[PDB]
Design a protein around this ligand. Sequence first.
Ligand code: HEM
Ligand SMILES: O=C1N[C@@H](Cc2ccc(O)cc2)C(=O)N[C@H]1Cc1ccc(O)cc1
Ligand code: HPA
Length: 389
Amino acid sequence: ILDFPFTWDGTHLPAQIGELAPVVKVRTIAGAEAWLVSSYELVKQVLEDDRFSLKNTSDPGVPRQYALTIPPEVVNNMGNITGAGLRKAVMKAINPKAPGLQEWMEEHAAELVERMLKHGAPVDIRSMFTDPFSEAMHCQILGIPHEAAPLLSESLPIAFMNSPREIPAARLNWDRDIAYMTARLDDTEQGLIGDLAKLRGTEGYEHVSDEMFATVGVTLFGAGVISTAGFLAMALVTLLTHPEEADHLADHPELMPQAVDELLRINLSIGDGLPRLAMEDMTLGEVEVKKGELVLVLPEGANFDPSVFPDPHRLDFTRANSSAHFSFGGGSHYCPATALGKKHAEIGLRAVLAAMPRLRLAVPVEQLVWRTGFMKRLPERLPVMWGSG
Ligand code: HEM
Ligand SMILES: O=C1N[C@@H](Cc2ccc(O)cc2)C(=O)N[C@H]1Cc1ccc(O)cc1
Ligand code: HPA
């Protein structure tokens, strides 16, 4: 019996990945059977076929990867936002081209980096950079006060838990976070919450409750902040384990857009599978998947498939097909925020590398503490030091 996940240690690809058949039976954190899918070919096939349903992964009594920390219907969040007529408002808010946002992200990154320079080495670049940068950007696009980020952010280490059991803290924090966004609809003039407040009580939006409106602010803050802060921390882990490549990118800032594609391809921040329930009997490679069975898509399996990414462990900023990675998923549930995610990372990484020469890990790499029982692989602290000039 093979247990999934394999390890919370994000310093390199788990040894198990190179040994997997493209489709393997595993036992999940919740005790269920699942088909783990790890070849580039079959990851593509699952993500691009809607008979492998994300929505149905929260149906009553279905095999689970781990306990829900949200209402079951919120697994279909993007579908619900569309059905409620709120897709236009959401796509506008997550567009990095929104007026002033690029200049705001550049000034905020510059400001956080200057605070790290005034503090001096060593610093925890997660709590002084990746977290505050990701949090404040999400307050900015939601339209809410930046001083709300600490309190909403406090929910995140529990909200994205991968637990064998129901987490009582998840419901307490959800209700608190929903109440907070509900209050913001009454006093917010700008960004997404401002937009939603203008739609509320107008023709065509009679079917949208206050709770449904609030659920858009809570879910986009949570999914955006955990994925952006999670990626940027683990992009810094990649660069800190390849300091010659990190030095090269600091001297060639014109590489940054290509660099972010290769950092996404090589990233180890995904600590679980992308879940899909088989809505009918289906052949997947050499495996017969029965209706009702859970399928776990492993993006790191596809992204380190040597038949698509030759020498997959090599960090090659100029890899021609970097952007063919599955770190934003694929098919119908493809991440709607790729433009923002890529731009946020480019600005954040440029600010760090321009100002912190010869950036290095300030502790032995095997002295990092890895978060366990969590959707993302993440070091609890990321202490860094840097040269002078
Ligand atoms: C580097 C940043 C990011 C990464 C690596 C990332 C990754 C992903 C992935 C892998 C999925 C697919 C889940 C699945 O197929 O089951 C996804 C979906 C999603 N992401 Fe992102 N994401 C990022 C940034 C963001 C941001 C900034 C937001 C929102 C502000 C966001 C909102 C969403 C939403 C709502 C979905 C669900 C889409 C659907 O069901 O159709 N993501 N993301
Ligand atoms: O299950 C969901 N839940 C929410 C995300 C979410 C999960 C928990 C939470 O407390 C807040 C948001 C969603 O938008 N769609 C789906 C899929 C998902 C999961 C994680 C993630 O980062 C992005 C998407
Ligand atoms: O890391 C992740 N795991 C599962 N689903 C996700 N949706 C966005 N990011 C993730």
